[PDB]
Amino acid sequence: NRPVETENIARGKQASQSSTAHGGAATRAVDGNVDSDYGHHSVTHTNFEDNAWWQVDLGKTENVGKVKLYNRGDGNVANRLSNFDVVLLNEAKQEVARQHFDSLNGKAELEVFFTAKDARYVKVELKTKNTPLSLAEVEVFRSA
Ligand SMILES: CC(=O)N[C@@H]1[C@@H](O[C@@H]2O[C@@H](C)[C@@H](O)[C@@H](O)[C@@H]2O)[C@H](O[C@@H]2O[C@H](CO)[C@H](O)[C@H](O)[C@H]2O[C@@H]2O[C@@H](C)[C@@H](O)[C@@H](O)[C@@H]2O)[C@@H](CO)O[C@H]1O
Ligand SMILES: [Ca+2]
Ligand SMILES: [Mg+2]
Ligand SMILES: [Mg+2]
């Protein structure tokens, strides 16, 4: 949890999520556009379901120091991103780190710092019932 590199290594990587609704493709959270208005097409959306999740494959194991989430901003539904974990997984898809968050507290973004963790996947997992996961962008930075 000290300095991080400036390059967003999640941009343009393979992304996936638990389901897709309202056209909100998982790749919208790694398209290099943090615009949080759903109508501008750069925010993801899963079904309303239990324990929705979204993941990016960094494509190799990297030493991750920071993951920045940008929430949806339009429609007074920003609170759907609450009671969730940010998880780092190794190449074998085992958990190597996990942090839980109750809220973003109305902030547009959350910066999550990891202590130099070697991981290939970054996952956001909701812990709530019957709630869709929408992210405008997830950016990931290596430890410096
Ligand atoms: C009609 C269509 O093509 N899609 C609508 C959704 O409307 C589109 O996307 C919205 C976010 C706006 O950009 C809207 O102008 C656009 O037509 C529609 O979403 C609701 O749309 C109303 C306006 O009609 C409000 O914007 C509302 O906040 C939207 O609902 C929210 O966003 C959705 C994507 C879901 O997450 C809802 O649960 C939210 O409450 C959806 C609305 O059900 O229906 C499509 O037909
Ligand atoms: Ca985006
Ligand atoms: Mg507009
Ligand atoms: Mg893959």
Numbering used by the authors: 41 to 184
From the publication, what sentences describe this entry?
Lectinolysin (LLY) is a pore-forming toxin derived from some strains of Streptococcus mitis and S. pseudopneumoniae and is a member of the cholesterol-dependent cytolysin (CDC) family. While LLY shares a number of characteristics typical of CDCs, it has a unique 162 amino acid N-terminal domain. Glycan array experiments revealed that LLY was highly selective for the difucosylated glycans Lewis y (Ley) and Lewis b (Leb) antigens. In the work presented here a Y62H mutation was designed and constructed with the aim of removing the hydrogen bond between the N-acetylglucosamine (GlcNAc) of Leb and LLYlec and instead, gain a hydrogen bond with Ley.
The structures of the LLYlecwt-Ley and LLYlecY62H-Ley superimpose very closely, with a rms deviation of the alpha carbon atoms of 0.1 Å. A third metal ion binding site is observed in the mutant structure and we have tentatively identified it as a Mg2+ ion binding site due to the very high concentrations of this ion in the crystallization buffer. The Mg2+ ion is bound between the carboxylate of Asp97 and the side-chain carbonyl of Gln54 and four water molecules, all arranged in octahedral geometry around the metal ion. The water structure is the same as in LLYlecwt-Ley apart from a water molecule that is positioned between the hydroxyl group of Tyr62 and fucose 1 (Fuc 1). This water molecule is shifted by 1.4 Å toward the NE2 of His62 in the mutant structure, compared to wild-type, to optimize its interaction with the His side-chain. LLYlecY62H forms the same 19 van der Waals interactions with Ley compared to the wild-type protein: 15 with Fuc 1, 1 with Gal, 2 with GlcNAc, and 1 with Fuc 2. The B-factor of Ley is 53.5 Å2 in the mutant (overall B-factor of protein is 29 Å2), compared to 38.2 Å2 in the wild-type protein (overall B-factor of protein complex is 21 Å2). Overall, there is no net change in the number of potential hydrogen binding and van der Waals interactions between wild-type and mutant Ley complexes. In the LLYlecY62H-Ley complex, there was no additional bond formation between the Lewis antigen and His62, only a shift of a water molecule toward the His, as compared to its position relative to Tyr62 in the wild-type. The mutation causes an overall 2.5-fold decrease in the lectin domain’s affinity for Ley and doubles its affinity for Leb over the wild-type domain.
